[PDB]
Design an enzyme around this catalytic site. Structure first.
Site, PDB file in Angstrom:
ATOM      1  N   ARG A 183      56.030  33.834  37.860  1.00 30.89           N
ATOM      2  CA  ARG A 183      55.263  35.037  38.108  1.00 30.89           C
ATOM      3  C   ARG A 183      56.389  36.190  38.440  1.00 30.89           C
ATOM      4  NH1 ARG A 183      51.159  29.688  39.600  1.00 30.89           N
ATOM      5  NH2 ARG A 183      48.987  30.694  38.599  1.00 30.89           N
ATOM      6  N   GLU A 208      60.229  35.531  38.262  1.00 31.42           N
ATOM      7  CA  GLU A 208      61.273  35.579  39.067  1.00 31.42           C
ATOM      8  C   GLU A 208      60.940  34.606  39.696  1.00 31.42           C
ATOM      9  OE1 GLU A 208      59.896  38.311  38.685  1.00 31.42           O
ATOM     10  OE2 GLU A 208      60.656  39.193  40.775  1.00 31.42           O
ATOM     11  N   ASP A 234      58.177  50.016  47.370  1.00 31.55           N
ATOM     12  CA  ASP A 234      57.041  49.688  46.762  1.00 31.55           C
ATOM     13  C   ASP A 234      56.341  49.052  46.360  1.00 31.55           C
ATOM     14  OD1 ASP A 234      57.337  49.439  43.244  1.00 31.55           O
ATOM     15  OD2 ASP A 234      58.221  48.150  42.827  1.00 31.55           O
TER      16      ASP A 234
END
Ligand SMILES: CC(C)(O)C#Cc1ccc2c(c1)-c1nc(C(N)=O)cn1CCO2
Length: 324
Positions: free
Chosen positions: A63, A68, A170
Site C-alpha cells: 500500500r 511502500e 501534500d
C-alpha cells in the site's frame, strides 16, 4: 555540550525510548539503529531487523503510492502494525517531527523508527478503514455531509501541525487514513513536511506535492506558508464531491500553468451543495494566501456548514455515486 553525547548514546542500537530521543537520532539520518516508542515493538539485544525480529504479513500486499507501506508483526510480542519504508538516501527528518510526540487524534500514531542498511522503517498504528482516497474510488464520490465531516477532521490535524509551525505539504485523500468504522480520520504521509517561520518552496533538492492540489504560490515560485495546506485540503474537498481531482476535467496539457493563470476552480463546486459549503470552499481557494482562510478559520466554517445540512447522517459506505 550535552546534545552531542545524548545522540552518540542512541547510535548503533535500537532501544525502547521516547519520541524526543527518536527525533534527535533521526536527524543524523537526514548499521541497525533506532528508537521504538511502544512496548508492542521490542528490540532484542540492541537490534530490530526485518525478517528476524519483525515480519511482514504474507502474502506481501503493498500500500501507498510506491507500495511502500505494509502490514507487519513483531515476532516476540505478536502485535501488528504498519510499516513505511523510506530510502535512507532521501530520508527527511521532518517526516518524523510531524508525527513524533504528537499525541493528536488527527495525526496517525507513531510507534517508532529503525534504520536497517539502505532503509528507514517507520512503524505506526494500523488504521483498518483504508485511506480516504480508496473510499472515493469505491463509492465514486462522497455525499456532502461526509465530505464536510472528513474535511473538518483533516483541518483539525492541520490546526495542530500549523500551531507547531509544521506544514504537511501534500494534503490529499490518499494521505488521510480512516478508522475501521469510518468515524475517525488521521493525517499521514508527512514526507513533504516543512518546519516554518514564509518563503519559496522551489529551491534546492525539495520534492513537492501532488500537482492538482498545488496552491498558486507553490506553482509560481512565491512565498509559501501554512496556507498552502488549506488550498490542497479544498482541492481534496472537490475530489470528494466530484470523484475526480480539480483541473483534470477542463485541462490535460500541463496543469501547473493553468493554476498560475486561471481563476481558482470554484466553478467545480457542485450546484447542489448548500450555500455555506460553497462559501467555505471559496474561502480556502483564494489565490493570494493572505486572503485565504487559515486552518482554524476554515475548520470552524466547515463545522457550521455540516450543522447547516443536518449533521453527519449518510452511512460510511452507502451506494455508488457516479463522478461528474
Ligand atoms: C506517518 C508517515 C510515516 O509519514 C506515513 C505514512 C504513510 C504513507 C502512506 C500510506 C500510509 C502511511 C498508510 N498507513 C496506514 C496505516 N497506518 O494503517 C495505511 N496506509 C496506506 C496509505 O499509505
Amino acid at each position: 555540550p550535552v546534545e552531542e553525547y545524548l545522540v552518540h548514546a542512541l547510535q548503533g542500537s535500537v532501544s525502547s525510548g521516547q519520541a524526543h530521543s527518536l527525533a534527535s537520532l533521526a536527524k543524523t539520518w537526514s548499521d541497525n539503529e533506532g528508537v521504538l516508542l511502544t512496548e508492542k515493538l521490542k528490540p532484542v539485544d540492541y537490534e530490530y531487523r526485518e525478517e528476524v525480529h519483525w515480519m511482514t504479513h504474507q502474502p506481501r500486499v503493498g500500500r501507498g503510492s510506491f507500495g511502500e507501506v505494509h502490514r507487519m508483526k513483531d515476532k516476540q510480542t505478536g502485535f501488528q502494525c504498519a510499516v513505511k519504508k523510506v530510502r535512507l538516501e532521501v530520508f527527511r527528518v521532518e517526516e518524523l517531527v510531524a508525527c513524533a510526540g504528537l499525541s493528536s487524534p488527527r495525526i496517525v500514531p507513531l510507534y517508532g523508527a529503525v534504520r536497517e542498511g539502505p532503509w528507514v522503517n517507520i512503524f505506526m498504528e494500523l488504521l483498518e478503514g483504508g485511506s480516504l482516497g480508496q473510499l472515493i474510488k469505491q463509492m465514486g464520490c462522497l455525499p456532502e455531509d461526509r465530505a464536510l465531516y472528513y474535511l473538518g477532521q483533516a483541518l483539525e490535524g492541520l490546526e495542530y501541525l500549523h500551531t507547531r509551525r509544521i506544514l504537511h505539504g501534500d494534503v490529499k485523500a490518499d494521505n488521510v487514513l480512516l478508522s475501521s468504522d469510518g468515524s475517525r480520520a488521521a493525517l499521514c504521509d508527512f514526507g513533504h513536511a516543512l518546519c516554518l517561520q514564509g518563503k519559496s518552496l522551489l529551491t534546492g533538492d525539495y520534492i513537492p506535492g501532488t500537482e492538482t492540489h498545488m496552491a498558486p504560490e507553490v506553482v509560481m515560485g512565491k512565498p509559501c506558508d501554512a496556507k498552502v495546506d488549506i488550498w490542497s485540503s479544498c482541492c481534496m474537498m472537490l475530489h470528494m464531491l466530484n470523484g475526480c481531482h480539480p483541473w483534470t476535467q477542463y485541462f490535460r496539457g500541463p496543469l501547473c500553468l493553468k493554476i498560475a493563470s486561471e481563476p481558482p476552480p470554484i466553478r467545480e463546486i457542485p450546484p447542489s451543495c448548500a450555500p455555506l459549503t460553497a462559501q467555505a470552499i471559496q474561502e480556502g481557494l483564494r489565490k493570494e494566501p493572505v486572503h485565504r482562510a487559515s486552518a482554524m478559520e476554515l475548520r470552524r466554517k466547515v463545522g457550521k456548514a455540516l450543522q447547516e445540512v443536518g449533521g453527519l447522517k449518510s452511512p460510511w459506505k452507502g451506494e455508488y455515486k457516479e463522478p461528474r
